[PDB]
Design a protein around this ligand. Structure first.
Ligand SMILES: Nc1ncnc2c1ncn2[C@@H]1O[C@H](COP(=O)(O)OP(=O)(O)O)[C@@H](O)[C@H]1O
Ligand SMILES: Nc1ncnc2c1ncn2[C@@H]1O[C@H](COP(=O)(O)OP(=O)(O)O)[C@@H](O)[C@H]1O
Ligand SMILES: [Mg+2]
Ligand SMILES: [Mg+2]
Ligand SMILES: [Mg+2]
Lengths: 526, 49, 534, 104, 107
C-alpha cells in the first residue's frame, strides 16, 4: 500500500509523505523554480533583482549575485533548499559561480525529469551522470592553462579574470577601473589569501568611478584631544592592552581601609600605575599608539603631553590590518621593548571623505593589507559594488593560490559537453541517453548567457558546438557583437578552480536530488 | 530438588509472557538470582538493566 | 471503538473509566489487522531504500531543515509517527542500529513481511500466539543455518582487503559510493587504528567524524591525529609548527583564583604595589614554566588574556585557547601527552609530540581549523569530510558511521555471510525443509516465515528493475540445484549471481540480529489484541 | 564436525556426514610422505596422479556425498594406507577433513 | 503533446506565430500523407466485411470488451449492417440487464 494512502494514516496531524511521482514532481518544480529565478542574472547582459525584505525594517538590496539572492528568499521546498545551500557553499569555496552552479543543477534536474518521463530509472541516470562528470572533469583539466611562472602573462591573466568576474555586475560600467583596483589590492597581499586584509569602506556620495584603492591605509577611528593630527616618519605601537581603569586580574581584591586618606592614597596609586604603564609604552620610542581597546581620559592626557597620537577603539580587525600595513606587533606587555617590533609609515594625517574624517596612513612599510573606498549614489549601489568587489577579490585570491585558468564565454561548458557527447555516443544503453542530457545542460549554460543578451542563442550555441567538434577548443561567445570568437584572444578567462567547482557541485546536488523518491514532512512547529 | 522446584514454579509464572520461548533460560537465571541473595531476599539487591 | 457502551440496565449513570466517552478501544482481530496495516505501511515505505539501487528519502523537520538519507533508522527517527505499532517499528530500527549499525532497513522490511504473512494466517484462523511460536521455531532454524553457511574473514592489519570489501558492501547503498573504495579504506583504517584487538572493543569516541562544507567528497580523508575548529590565539603567531612539543593544559593562563569565597584586602599603597607585582610575576612565571618544560606549543582548555597571549607570542610559544574537553582528551591520547591541571605540574615528560601542527583555511570564509598529525602511534583518529552541501555531508557522516560499525562488528566476530539476498534465500530454503519435516500446525507459520525471508531478495530485484518472482525463483532453484548459498540478486548487473565472487559481504552478527529482532518484535506485536487510547 | 567413514582389482569407498552444506571435492590419498591417489570435483572433473593413471574408476555419488574408488592392476607397491579427503563448505584450508585411512 | 512542445519552443524563444505557421504547414503535410496512405474496400463486399470486423476489433481493443472482443466485434458488425446503410444509431437499442456474464450478451 502506502504510508499516506492507507486505510490507516500513520502520522501526526500536520505531517505529510509525498510518494514517488509526487515527490519527484515537487522536487523538480522547486529546483527548476530556483534556477529560473536565478537566471537572467547570468553573464555580462545579466540584470539585477530587488530583494525588498518584508520584515518591519524592510531592508532593500539590489543584487545580481545568485548566492545572495537565494540566501535572501523564503524557500520552503526541500529540493530548492538543497540548491540554496549548494550556492552558499559555492560562495564559501570560491567567490564566483554561484549563479552558474544553480542554473546547471536546475538544468540537470529538468533533463532528469524529461528522462524519468522517458521511463529511465533515477539510478541509470545517476550512473550516466557520474560517467559524464568524470569525462567533463578530465576535459576541463586538459583544457586548463597555467601562467603563474611568467609574471607578465600572469598579471594579464589576473586582469582578464577580474574583468570576466566583474562583467556580470554593476561595476562593468567602470570595469577597466575596478579591475585594476581589485588586481592591485590582491597583489598587495603578497601571496596571502586573507580577504579580511582588504578592508572596503562604502562612502555614500561621489561617483562609482571616484572609487579607489588607497596607496596606504585608512581608518575610521578618532584621535585623542590634546594629541597631534599629523605625524611624519611615524613610529607606531599597535596594542591590545586595557588602558581603561585597568584593574589587577585578582578579583577577590578589594580596598578595605579605615581612612578616606588611605582611600585617596590607593586612588593615587592606581593613577601612578596607569602613568607607569604609559611610561613603559613611551619607552618604545613611538609617535603613534593604536589600541584595540579603549583609552581613558588619563592615558589620553599622558599621550597628549608626550606628543603621541593615541588612536583608541580600533578593533581586532583594525589592529590586524594595521600590523599587516605597518609591520608592527600587536602587544599587551611593555617590559621588553627590544622585542616589540614597531610599525612605520612616512605620514599619518586626517583626511576627508564625504563628510567624515579618517586616519590616513601613507608611506606604509609593508602594505600587506588594503583599504578600498567605494563611492556611489545609493546605498544599494554601494552594497552591490562591495559584493561585486568581493567576488573579484575572492576569484583573484583563488587564482594566486592556483594559477590554472580556463576560458569563459561558454567555451569551457561547450568543451565539457563535447567530451560528454563523445563518451555518450561511445557508450551503449540508456546511460548514453542520460549522458546526452548532461551535455544538454552543459550547453544550456552558454545558451542562457546568450539569451540574456538577446541573441540567437540557438544559432550561436550551434556554431559553438560545431567549432568544438571541429577542434576549436577556444571558441566561445563574443558578447560585444553577438558572435563566436577566440576566448584566448578576447581575454575571457576563468579560474579552473571556479569552473571545476561549479561542475562538481552542480552534478553532486543534482545526484542527491535525483536519489529522492519520498518526502516525509514533519508537522510544522507553529 | 529445591532448585528444580523453584525452576518449575518460575517457568510456570513465565508461561504467559513474551519470553515464554526463552522461559527455561530466564527461569534458570531468576533462580540463580534469588538463590544468591541474602536472607531478606531484597529486590533492591537484584539489578535489572 | 468505545470503552463502555451500557449506561445501565436500570437507567442510572454507568461511569467506570475517566473520559470513557472521549476514549477509544480496539479489541481482537481488528486490532491485530490495524497493527498489520500500520506495519505494512512503514515497511512498504522503507523497502524502496534497500540495496545499491535503493533510493533516498528527504526528511523535513519541525523547523524546516532538510535531511536526505537512505538510512532506515534515521528515516524512522525523523518520521513524525503517531501509530504505536509504527513507533515499535522505529524502535526496532533504532535497536538494529544500536546493536549493529547496519540492517536498519532490512529489519523493518522483514518485520513488515512477517506481519503481512501473519495476516493471511489469522484469516485462515490460526492463533496469533501459534503464529509467533512458529515464527520463533523458523527463526531458530534460520539462525542456525546462517551459522552453518557463514564464512570467515581475516581481521589483520596486513591484508585489509576482506574488511575493505565488507565496508564497500555497507557503503554500496549510500550516496558516497562515488568515492566507494576511498570511503571503505578510511573506515577500515580508522577502526583498525582505534580498536582494542585483545579486548575486541572499538571506542567510537576515539573516532572524530568532522564535516566541513566546501571542497569535494573526494577530499574526505583520515587524519591520524586530531582536527580542531580553533586557531592560534594571536594573529601574528605562525600558522605551522613542525615537530611540536605540546603542553596540554586545563589551567587558564590567568592569575590564580581560589574556588572558595575569598577577599584579598588591600590596605596600603605597599599592598597595592605588591598586588601589581604579583600579577606581573604570575604571568611571567606561567610563560617561563611552559618554556622550561621545552614545549613549542601550548593548548589550553579555558582561554587566556592579553598579557599571557603577548608573552606566548614574544617567547615563540604558539598557543590555542578555548579548546574543549573532548578534543583536549583526544589531543592528549593522539600526541602521547598528559593533561596538566596547573603550570607547576608541567614537565618535559607530560608533553605530547606531533610532527605537524598546522592551521588550515577554507577558501573565502575566514574560518580556520587546526590539524594535529604525524604523531608516532596515535590511538585516536579523525575523519574530515568535505562536500558541496550540508545534506551530502550529513549523509556521508552517517554512511561512514555504518561502515565503521561494520568493521567493528567484524572485529567482534569475523564470521561473514554473503549478501545480495543470498543468505535470506538460503535461510528460506532451510526453513521450508524443516517445515516439511514438521507435522504440527506450525508448518504454516514456518512456511510464512520463509515467504517473509524471501521479501529482501524480492525487494532488491524490484529496486534493481528485475522481475521479483522470476529472478528469485531462478536463483532459488540454482541454490537448491548447485549447492551455493552465495547465489543472490545481481543488483548491479555484473552478470554473475555469485555474491562470493562479487564480494558482496555482510556480517553474520548483522544478519542474525536482523532475524532475531524482527522475530521478537513481530511476536510482541502479534501478542497485542487490545488498544486503548484517548 | 564432518564425520568420514571408509569402506588385481578392488574398490574402496569413503562417505561423509555431519554438519556442512556442500562437499566441493573428494580425493583419495595414500600413506612415505602423503600424496593424492586421485581427486574429483563436483562437476565430475577428475584429475589423476602421475605415478598411476588411466586405470582408475573413481566415481562420486552426490546424492549421499560419497565417493567410490575402483582400482585394478594391483601391485605390491599399491600396499599402503589409503586416506580420503573432503573439501566442504567454502573450501577454506580449515575445511579439509581427513579419514583415519585404510591399510590394505 | 503539441502544447508541451510549444512551451518548449517558447522557452527556445520562438514566437507563437512562427510556431502556428509551421504547425499549419505540418498539418497540411500530415493530411496529405494520411489521405495518400488511406485505403478503400467498400466495393469488394468480402474485404469490406473484413475491414469492418478489423475496425470494430481495433475500436474495442482499448475497452472492457477486449475480453470478449471476437464476440462483441461480431455483435457490433451485424448490428451496424442490419441498418442497411442508414447511420441512425438510435435504431440500435441497447438494453443493459444486470446479471449474467459479459459473454452472455447478444444481438
Ligand atoms: N565578457 C564576457 N564574455 C562572455 N562571457 C562572459 C563574459 N564575462 C562573463 N562571462 C560568462 O558568464 C558566466 C558567469 O556569469 P555570472 O553572472 O558571473 O554568474 P556566476 O555567479 O555563475 O559567475 C561564465 O560562464 C562566464 O564565462
Ligand atoms: N553490491 C550489491 N549487490 C547485491 N546486493 C547488495 C549489494 N550491496 C548491498 N546489497 C544488499 O542490499 C541490502 C540492504 O543493504 P543497505 O540498504 O546498505 O542497508 P540495510 O541493510 O540497512 O538496508 C543488503 O541485504 C544487501 O544484501
Ligand atoms: Mg561572476
Ligand atoms: Mg547497509
Ligand atoms: Mg477507441
Amino acid at each position: 500500500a502506502s504510508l499516506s494512502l492507507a486505510p490507516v494514516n500513520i502520522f501526526k496531524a500536520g505531517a505529510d509523505e509525498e510518494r514517488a511521482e509526487t515527490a519527484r514532481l515537487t522536487s523538480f518544480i522547486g529546483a527548476i523554480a530556483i534556477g529560473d529565478l536565478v537566471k537572467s542574472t547570468l553573464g555580462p547582459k545579466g540584470m539585477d533583482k530587488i530583494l525588498l525584505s518584508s520584515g518591519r525594517d524592510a531592508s532593500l538590496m539590489v543584487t545580481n549575485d545568485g548566492a545572495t539572492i537565494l540566501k535572501n528568499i523564503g524557500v520552503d521546498n526541500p529540493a530548492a533548499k538543497v540548491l540554496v545551500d549548494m550556492s552558499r557553499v559555492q560562495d564559501d569555496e570560491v567567490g564566483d559561480g554561484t549563479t552558474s552552479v544553480t542554473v546547471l543543477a536546475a538544468e540537470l534536474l529538468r533533463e532528469a525529469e524529461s528522462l524519468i518521463a522517458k521511463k529511465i530509472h533515477p539510478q541509470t541516470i545517476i550512473a550516466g551522470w557520474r560517467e559524464a562528470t568524470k569525462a567533463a572533469r578530465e576535459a576541463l583539466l586538459s583544457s586548463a592553462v597555467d601562467h603563474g611562472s611568467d609574471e607578465v602573462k600572469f598579471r594579464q591573466d589576473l586582469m582578464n579574470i577580474a574583468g570576466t568576474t566583474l562583467s556580470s555586475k554593476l561595476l562593468t560600467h567602470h570595469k577597466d577601473h575596478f579591475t585594476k583596483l581589485a588586481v592591485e589590492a590582491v597583489l598587495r597581499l603578497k601571496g596571502s589569501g586573507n580577504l579580511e586584509a582588504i578592508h572596503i569602506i562604502k562612502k555614500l556620495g561621489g561617483s562609482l568611478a571616484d572609487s579607489y584603492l588607497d596607496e596606504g591605509f585608512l581608518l575610521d577611528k578618532k584621535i585623542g584631544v590634546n594629541q597631534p593630527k599629523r605625524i611624519e616618519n611615524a613610529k607606531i605601537l599597535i596594542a591590545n592592552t586595557g588602558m581603561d581603569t585597568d584593574k589587577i586580574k585578582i578579583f577577590g581584591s578589594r580596598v578595605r581601609v579605615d581612612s578616606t586618606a588611605k582611600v585617596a592614597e590607593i586612588e593615587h596609586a592606581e593613577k601612578e600605575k596607569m602613568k607607569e604603564k604609559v611610561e613603559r609604552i613611551l619607552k618604545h620610542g613611538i609617535n603613534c599608539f593604536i589600541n584595540r581597546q579603549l583609552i581613558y581620559n588619563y592615558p589620553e592626557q599622558l599621550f597628549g603631553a608626550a606628543g603621541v597620537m593615541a588612536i583608541e577603539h580600533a578593533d581586532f580587525a583594525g589592529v590586524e590590518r594595521l600590523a599587516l600595513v605597518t609591520g608592527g606587533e600587536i602587544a599587551s606587555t611593555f617590559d621588553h621593548p627590544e622585542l616589540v617590533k614597531l610599525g612605520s609609515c612616512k605620514l599619518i594625517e586626517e583626511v576627508m571623505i564625504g563628510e567624515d574624517k579618517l586616519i590616513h596612513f601613507s608611506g606604509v612599510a609593508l602594505g600587506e593589507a588594503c583599504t578600498i573606498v567605494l563611492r556611489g549614489a545609493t546605498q544599494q549601489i554601494l552594497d552591490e559594488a562591495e559584493r561585486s568587489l568581493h567576488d573579484a577579490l575572492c576569484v583573484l585570491a583563488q587564482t594566486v593560490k592556483d594559477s590554472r585558468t580556463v576560458y569563459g564565454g561558454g567555451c569551457s561548458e561547450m568543451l565539457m559537453a563535447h567530451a560528454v557527447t563523445q563518451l555518450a555516443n561511445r557508450t551503449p544503453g540508456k546511460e548514453a541517453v542520460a549522458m546526452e542530457s548532461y551535455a544538454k545542460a552543459l550547453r544550456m549554460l552558454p545558451t542562457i548567457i546568450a539569451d540574456n543578451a538577446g541573441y540567437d542563442s540557438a544559432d550561436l550555441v550551434a556554431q559553438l558546438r560545431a567549432a568544438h567538434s571541429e577542434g576549436n577548443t577556444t571558441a566561445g561567445l563574443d558578447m560585444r557583437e553577438g558572435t563566436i570568437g577566440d576566448m584566448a584572444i578576447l581575454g575571457i578567462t576563468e579560474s579552473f578552480q571556479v569552473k571545476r567547482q561549479v561542475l562538481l557541485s552542480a552534478a553532486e546536488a543534482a545526484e542527491v536530488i535525483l536519489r529522492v523518491d519520498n518526502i516525509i514532512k514533519a508537522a510544522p512547529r507553529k | 530438588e529445591q532448585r528444580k522446584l523453584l525452576e518449575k514454579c518460575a517457568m510456570t509464572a513465565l508461561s504467559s509472557k513474551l519470553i515464554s520461548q526463552q522461559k527455561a533460560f530466564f527461569a534458570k537465571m531468576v533462580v540463580d538470582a534469588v538463590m544468591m541473595l541474602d536472607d531478606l531476599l531484597q529486590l533492591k539487591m537484584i539489578g535489572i538493566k | 471503538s468505545m470503552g463502555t457502551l451500557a449506561f445501565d440496565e436500570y437507567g442510572r449513570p454507568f461511569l467506570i473509566i475517566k473520559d470513557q466517552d472521549r476514549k477509544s478501544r480496539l479489541m481482537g482481530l481488528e486490532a491485530l489487522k490495524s497493527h498489520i496495516m500500520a506495519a505494512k505501511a512503514v515497511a512498504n515505505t522503507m523497502r524502496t531504500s534497500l540495496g545499491p539501487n535503493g533510493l533516498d528519502k528527504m526528511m523535513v523537520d519541525k523547523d524546516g531543515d532538510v535531511t536526505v538519507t537512505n538510512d532506515g533508522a534515521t528515516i524512522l527517527s525523523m518520521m513524525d509517527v503517531d501509530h504505536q505499532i509504527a513507533k515499535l517499528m522505529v524502535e526496532l530500527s533504532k535497536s538494529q542500529d544500536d546493536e549493529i549499525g547496519d540492517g536498519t532497513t532490512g529489519v523493518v522490511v522483514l518485520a513488515g513481511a512477517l506481519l503481512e504473512e501473519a495476516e493471511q494466517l489469522l484469516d485462515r484462523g490460526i492463533h496469533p500466539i501459534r503464529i509467533a511460536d512458529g515464527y520463533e521455531q523458523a527463526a531458530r532454524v534460520a539462525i542456525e543455518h546462517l551459522d552453518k553457511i557463514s564464512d570467515s574473514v581475516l581481521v589483520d592489519i596486513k591484508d585489509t582487503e576482506p574488511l575493505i570489501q565488507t565496508a564497500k558492501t555497507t557503503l554500496g547503498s549510500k550516496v558516497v559510493n562515488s568515492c566507494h573504495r576511498q570511503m571503505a579504506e578510511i573506515a577500515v583504517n580508522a577502526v583498525l587504528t582505534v580498536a582494542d584487538m585483545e579486548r575486541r572493543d572499538v571506542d567510537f569516541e576515539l573516532i572524530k567524524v568532522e564535516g566541513k562544507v566546501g571542497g569535494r567528497l573526494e577530499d574526505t580523508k583520515l587524519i591520524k591525529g586530531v582536527i580542531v575548529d580553533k586557531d592560534f590565539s594571536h594573529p601574528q603567531m605562525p600558522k605551522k609548527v613542525e615537530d611540536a612539543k605540546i603542553a596540554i593544559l586545563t589551567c587558564p593562563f590567568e592569575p590564580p583564583k581560589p574556588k572558595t569565597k575569598h577577599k584579598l584586602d588591600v590596605t596600603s599603597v605597599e599592598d597595592y604595589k605588591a598586588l601589581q607585582k604579583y600579577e606581573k610575576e604570575k604571568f611571567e612565571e606561567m610563560i617561563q614554566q611552559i618554556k622550561e618544560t621545552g614545549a613549542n606549543l601550548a593548548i589550553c582548555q579555558w582561554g587566556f588574556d592579553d598579557e599571557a597571549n603577548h608573552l606566548l607570542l614574544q617567547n615563540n610559544l604558539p598557543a590555542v585557547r578555548w579548546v574543549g574537553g573532548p578534543e583536549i582528551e583526544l589531543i592528549a591520547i593522539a600526541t602521547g601527552g598528559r593533561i596538566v591541571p596547573r603550570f607547576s605540574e608541567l614537565t618535559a615528560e607530560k608533553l605530547g609530540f606531533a610532527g605537524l601542527v598546522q592551521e588550515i583555511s577554507f577558501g573565502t570564509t575566514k574560518d580556520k581549523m587546526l590539524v594535529i598529525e604525524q604523531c608516532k602511534n596515535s590511538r585516536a583518529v579523525t575523519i574530515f569530510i568535505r562536500g558541496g552541501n550540508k545534506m551530502i555531508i550529513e549523509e556521508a557522516k552517517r554512511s561512514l558511521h555504518d561502515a565503521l560499525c561494520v568493521i567493528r562488528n567484524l572485529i567482534r566476530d569475523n564470521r561473514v555471510v554473503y549478501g545480495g539476498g543470498a543468505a535470506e534465500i538460503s535461510c528460506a530454503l532451510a526453513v521450508s525443509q524443516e517445515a516439511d519435516k514438521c507435522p504440527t500446525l506450525e508448518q504454516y507459520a514456518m512456511r510464512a516465515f520463509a515467504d517473509a525471508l524471501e521479501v529482501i531478495p524480492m525487494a532488491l530485484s524490484e529496486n534493481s528493475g528485475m522481475n521479483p518472482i522470476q529472478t528469485m525463483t531462478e536463483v532459488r532453484a540454482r541454490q537448491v540445484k548447485e549447492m551455493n548459498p552465495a547465489l543472490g540478486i545481481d543488483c548491479l548487473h555484473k552478470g554473475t549471481n555469485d555474491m562470493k565472487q562479487q564480494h558482496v559481504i555482510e556480517t553474520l552478527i548483522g544478519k542474525k540480529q536482523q532475524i532475531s529482532l524482527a522475530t521478537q518484535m513481530v511476536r510482541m506485536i502479534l501478542k497485542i489484541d487490545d488498544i486503548r487510547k484517548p | 564436525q564432518v564425520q568420514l567413514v571408509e569402506s588385481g582389482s578392488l574398490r574402496l569407498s569413503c562417505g561423509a556426514s555431519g554438519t556442512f552444506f556442500r562437499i566441493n571435492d573428494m580425493g583419495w590419498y595414500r600413506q612415505k610422505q602423503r600424496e593424492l591417489v586421485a581427486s574429483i570435483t563436483r562437476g565430475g572433473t577428475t584429475d589423476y596422479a602421475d605415478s598411476v593413471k588411466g586405470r582408475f574408476t573413481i566415481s562420486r555419488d552426490n546424492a549421499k556425498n560419497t565417493v567410490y574408488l575402483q582400482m585394478n592392476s594391483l601391485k605390491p607397491e599399491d600396499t599402503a594406507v589409503y586416506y580420503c579427503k573432503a573439501n566442504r563448505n567454502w573450501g577454506r584450508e580449515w575445511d579439509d577433513y581427513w579419514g583415519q585411512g585404510t591399510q590394505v
